[PDB]
């Protein structure tokens, strides 16, 4: 039958579903746990490599925002990858359509 | 049998002198009444040809005599005293009606005393006042007058109008179940006492006769046109043999219906017509409470065909102007 | 009085007002909402073969009297809840005791055991569009499981030609993209001493797939 | 609806105590040498060093809830960099004509000691800080 | 009509008669027509005083009156302050549940014995009841100097206290960029008139340390809220809350400190690793 | 509906009495009435549970089809004519007017059919001494017909019902305060195999009350008020009572 | 066994609203917002949308407990503005967000070759 992983997990049709953002902490989102050098001590993200190092010579940037999102969409077969993200995008805008459509209704 | 509401009743006792007492439980005792008071009536007309406006009236009058009977030791002429009690108890409803008038814009002056009158020829129709009806006391002699002759048919329809009120009152009572108590709302049911016998008189005729002076500015053509009951006719039947719901009900709502015409007296309408490659047109009066509408249609009928109808007497003298240059000529 | 009804199945709350629209050149007046209920009752009989039927459908209306019809095999009978409409004699003699209530109250509650509501299908706040020689009346289906499609019900004075006006009303269907839609008139068959019924009738024609 | 204080002082020493984004600063007023203070800086958001001049004021206003844009159109009351609200805890009576207030921000602290602002200073939630330089 | 099935339902009806109809078997309970003075068995329903206890029971606060509130799951779910009293955690403990039949016996436990009541204790004469766990340890998190909440927060922040004035406060720091400090959003949770002062081993009315306590008002001035503010402390925030506005008043305030507190750790996180035992 | 009621009777002797005080505790007339009714039973072919798809104890019972005839297929005599109803019930005593009554039930005398009062009554109200029967009412009313079969029978039989009996009734009634109603009536039973009275010897004395509450615990003690002032009243001319609960259960028996 | 359905989370229950919006009695021009059938997946979404509207003074929303799939939105907006029109504009201006990133995907995934 037709059905949701909110219903069962046997309905889910991605396996993990990787998410990264601000490789460097330049955002101050996280406060890193250490014993002498933060910096030596927690490994370097791949997506550093995608965004400039902060540059210590530098004022913190509280004006600074969370925008570009380094992910990675595993499917389990049941809809091809690209669909999982598709029909992710489609399922939230008809998701939102419901709450216009309800108002509507009022 | 049907509900006026207020100190409605009767009372009697007897004396030592072998007559019968009449007590009310108000209207207190006096054999066979103390002071009565009957309905009466009076129309005044005011013209002097248009002179200096002197007003006379002229009023049909009730006194089977001053001189009175009812014997002691006759409760025969006793009930001819409670006759009379009825009587009494039917000014009672004239009281309702003085109430029924508070709903129109003809007199009622400084809560005290309400008269009846009507503008055309300036006259004036009944009275009582928000006091009472009629009190006995003067001189008597006999000239009579010829608004005197009428003014007696108007107490008769007046007092007969609200027959009807008792009427239609005793229709719903037996017909429903809660009872009919508490009077006239919306003072529909109430109005139709002395309202409608205003509205019909004044309203209807005066209008009829401005709508046929309206007619004579059609009066230009050869023409011809011709006056019905025939609105009448189309609704409000009179005395039919169809009934209502019941045998014991479809006798009364026959009863209502024939004398229902005299309350239902909204201006019947008219028409005028051409033959030739043919036209016709046509007009009804509607009093709505003494509001006078004029309603109209016309058709000109010929191989194709063409229509307008319209339903104010200012747009009516305009309509008759357009109508002309529309009609032949 | 003759009649029609039709239902677009495949549709959204929208598709209402596109046809709206459509027309809204071809307007006279509008008058008030109008409302009905659509009930469908699977009967609970089993002694009763394969062989004939089962299946009632109740239809009440909100065209000024709280009356409902109701339909089974091409039979239909015509109630109502109304205490206003009752036959004045009836209720005089005592046969009514002048309460009635709605005759699927009485199904579903006193003979719950023979019959059995299976759906109910509401249309709430219809708009009431006025022509000249044709009423024609709009409401949104809504059942206990979402939306369900859009109604169009033509009621008409004229006898004359009203094969041309349905004609020209499933154009302007054709115009705003609603494909797969169902029609009905009847079938050339029942015979009206009382059409309202019949014309009531046919959204079960409508309604059934 | 008006200023309350005013003077140009310069900082003798920076603190971060074990807080990473906060910092107890003392400084002097440059005109008069009565005058001292002391208050936590969130350091993060406006960095200061020692020996910097800072103008440091108070004002009354610019009272119900707190709206956040059309600020654009709206008068921003600051020609200084970095503001605080606070309210007036302690008034301190530290000899002679001297005085001394203490200022919370928040839990961030302020004390300033001089003489002159008593015909300005009050026990009021209302009091603003800006600081420019 | 319910009937025994439903969840607001019942099981049983009463007569004059003195016999009981049971509405799981009786051909009329459908058509069963009530009669005043008859006894309808209902089921426990929200806001039903009902007696809670912890066994062994060596305390009056080991059996205290709660408000019900009909859940699912097979659990008996209670408020973590609560846990003290009781001396209950969640290793695995059961405990009883008894409910009055009388309104004589609901009276009784609504007013002696409701779990409020029992928040100032006449064993120590000080509150038998805290802030306990995550809210202790988040408690202290939040209200650091260094603590800075942006506006998005706040106000989901300041919409979880039940009942909030509407009221934004004004930022401790309104530019560059408005902030809100711990110590200013967990004191909306504070109610007016409560007044606090605690000097720690160093404070100085400029607590350097963040030492000690004052609130003035209801409204945090200084010093980090721990074990000593608000937990079952003799000084405490709960026993001035108590004692100044009422036991109602004081049992809100749990829920209201909680609800801010757990929300705000709950996006912050707190964890524990062999990396904390590691000198 | 509730209809709240206390019956008794008197022998075709003192109807004369009755009425004349009847006609003075009410001040209105007695009015002349009559009505058939038509019981209908679940078609004992089918066969089904007493359960709903909403798990419900729900028995069987029967529907009551009711509605009035006008006199002018009732009554036997013109000579006996007039329009009174009492020394005309002496005239209907023993035995059938017309009737046959199959004939209208499918029409005759290519045809719809008329406006019934459809009906199912509950048990009255249990009670240990009720100082009134109560008693509830399902009604709907059905206006006209339609369809294929639009025979009140063939409408019956389509939902799965089955005639069982039938009987016309014919009296007086009289419209009273407060909803009061008093019939006195005689009771007919119509079969094909010919018509006998039912209330042979006398009246059946119904006063009553419909409410529409039920659930106004006032209106109902009001109303019980009525009923008891009315008995109370006429109380050592005729005893209104409670008829037994078992007599007036149209269940399936 | 006192394990609600799982459908629960989702599927609306008998004569229940998506929506039942409610005013807020303690502000002016405030109101609340209860979402049924709805989680954060939706609310946090919303919330930070009303976030951008500048004529939007208050936005919050909160799962008051999680045995339940509901959510209390809380919308304030500057006099004249409605708060019904303000969730209106969010709802509308999530979606065509969604749809640029849907379009964007698509043109995306087509050039690549695996
Ligand atoms: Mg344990």
Known sequence: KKGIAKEHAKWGPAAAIEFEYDPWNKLKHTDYWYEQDSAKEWPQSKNCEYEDPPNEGDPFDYKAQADTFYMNVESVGSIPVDQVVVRGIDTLQKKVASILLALTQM | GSTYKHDRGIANIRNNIESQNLDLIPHGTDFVHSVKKFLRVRIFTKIESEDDYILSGESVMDRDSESEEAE?????????????????????????????????????????????????????????????????????????????????????????????????????????????????????????????????????????????????????????????????????????????????????????????????????????????????????????????????????????????????????????????????? | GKSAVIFVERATPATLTELKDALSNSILSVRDPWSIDFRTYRCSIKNLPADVSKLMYSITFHHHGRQTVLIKDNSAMVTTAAAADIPPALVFNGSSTGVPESIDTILSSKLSNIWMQRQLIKGDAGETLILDGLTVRLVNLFSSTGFKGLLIELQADEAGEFETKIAGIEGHLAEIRAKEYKTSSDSLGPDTSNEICDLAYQYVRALEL | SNTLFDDIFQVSEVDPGRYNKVCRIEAASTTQDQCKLTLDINVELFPVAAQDSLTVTIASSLTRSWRPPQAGDRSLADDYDYVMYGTAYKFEEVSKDLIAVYYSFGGLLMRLEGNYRNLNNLKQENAYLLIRR | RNGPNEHPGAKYVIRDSGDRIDLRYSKRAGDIQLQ???????????????????????????????????????????????????????????????????????????????????????????????????????????????????????????????????????????????????????????????????????????????????????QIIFGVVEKKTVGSSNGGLIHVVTREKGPQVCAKLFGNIQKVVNFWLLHNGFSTGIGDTIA | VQQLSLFGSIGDDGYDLLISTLTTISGNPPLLYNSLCTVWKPNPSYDVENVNSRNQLVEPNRIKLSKEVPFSYLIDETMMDKPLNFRILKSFTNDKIPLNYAMTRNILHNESCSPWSLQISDIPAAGNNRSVSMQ?????????????????????????????????????????????????????????????????????????????????????????????????????????????????????? | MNAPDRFELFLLGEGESKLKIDPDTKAPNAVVITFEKEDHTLGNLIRAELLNDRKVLFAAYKVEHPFFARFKLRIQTTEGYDPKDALKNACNSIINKLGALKTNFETEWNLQTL
């Not at chain 2, 006759?74 to 003085?98: G, S, T, V």
């Not at chain 2, 051409?274 to 009093?287: A, D, G, I, Q």
């Not at chain 5, 909440?149 to 106000?155: A, F, G, N, T, Y």
């Not at chain 6, 799965?160 to 019939?183: A, C, D, N, S």
């Open chain 5, 36 to 218: 005043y003075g008859w006894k309808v068995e209902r089921h426990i329903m929200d806001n039903d005083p009902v007696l809670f206890n912890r066994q062994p029971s060596l305390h009056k606060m080991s059996m205290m009156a709660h408000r019900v509130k009909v859940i699912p799951y097979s659990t008996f779910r209670l408020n973590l302050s609560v846990t003290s009293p009781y001396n209950a955690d969640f290793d695995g403990d059961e405990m009883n549940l008894h409910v009055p039949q009388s309104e004589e016996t609901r009276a009784e436990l609504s007013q002696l014995c409701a779990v409020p009541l029992q928040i100032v204790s006449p064993q120590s004469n000080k509150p038998c009841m805290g802030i306990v766990q995550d809210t202790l340890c988040g408690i202290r998190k939040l209200t650091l100097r260094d603590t800075f909440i942006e506006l998005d927060q706040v106000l989901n922040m300041l919409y979880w206290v039940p009942d909030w004035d509407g009221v934004i406060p004004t930022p401790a720091i309104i530019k560059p960029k408005p902030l809100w400090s711990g110590k200013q959003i967990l004191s909306v949770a504070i109610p007016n008139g409560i007044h606090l002062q605690r000097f720690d081993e160093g404070t100085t009315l400029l607590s350097p340390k963040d030492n000690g306590m004052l609130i003035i008002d209801g």
């Open chain 2, 72 to 329: 002691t030791k006759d409760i025969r002429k006793q009930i001819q005293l409670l006759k009379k009690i009825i009587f009494e108890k039917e000014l009672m409803y004239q009281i309702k009606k003085e109430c029924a008038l508070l709903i129109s814009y003809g007199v009622s002056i400084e809560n005290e005393n309400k008269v009846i009158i009507e503008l055309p020829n300036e006259k004036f129709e009944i009275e009582l006042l928000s006091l009472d009806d009629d009190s006995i006391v003067n001189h008597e002699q006999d000239l009579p007058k010829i608004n005197d002759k009428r003014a007696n048919l108007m107490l008769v329809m007046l007092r007969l109008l609200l027959v009807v009120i008792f009427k239609k009152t005793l229709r719903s009572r037996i017909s429903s179940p809660h009872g009919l108590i508490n009077l006239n709302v919306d003072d529909d049911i109430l109005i139709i006492r002395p309202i409608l016998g205003k509205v019909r008189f004044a309203n209807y005729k005066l209008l009829l006769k401005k709508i046929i002076k309206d007619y004579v500015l059609d009066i230009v053509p050869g023409s011809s046109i011709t006056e019905t009951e025939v609105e009448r006719e189309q609704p409000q039947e009179n005395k039919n043999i169809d009934d209502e719901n019941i045998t014991k009900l479809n006798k009364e709502i026959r009863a209502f219906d024939k004398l229902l015409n005299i309350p239902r007296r909204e201006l019947k309408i008219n028409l005028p017509l051409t033959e030739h490659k043919s036209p016709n047109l046509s007009l009804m009066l509607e009093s709505p409470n003494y509001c006078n509408a004029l309603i109209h249609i016309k058709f000109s009928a010929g191989t194709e065909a063409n229509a307008v109808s319209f339903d104010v007497e200012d747009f009516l003298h305009f309509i008759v102007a357009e109508y002309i240059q529309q009609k032949k000529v």
């Open chain 6, 136 to 253: 509830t009412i399902a009604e709907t009313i059905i206006l006209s017909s339609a369809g294929k079969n639009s025979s009140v029978s063939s409408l019956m039989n389509g939902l799965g019902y089955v005639f069982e009996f039938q009987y016309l009734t014919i009296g007086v009634k009289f419209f009273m305060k407060h909803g009061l109603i008093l019939e006195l009536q005689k009771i007919w039973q119509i079969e094909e195999a010919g018509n006998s009275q039912i209330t042979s010897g006398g009246f059946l004395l119904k006063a009553y009350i419909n409410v529409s509450r039920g659930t106004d615990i006032d209106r109902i003690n009001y109303t019980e008020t009525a009923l008891m002032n009315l008995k109370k009243e006429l109380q050592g001319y005729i005893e209104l009572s409670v008829p037994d609960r078992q007599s007036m259960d149209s269940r399936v028996a």
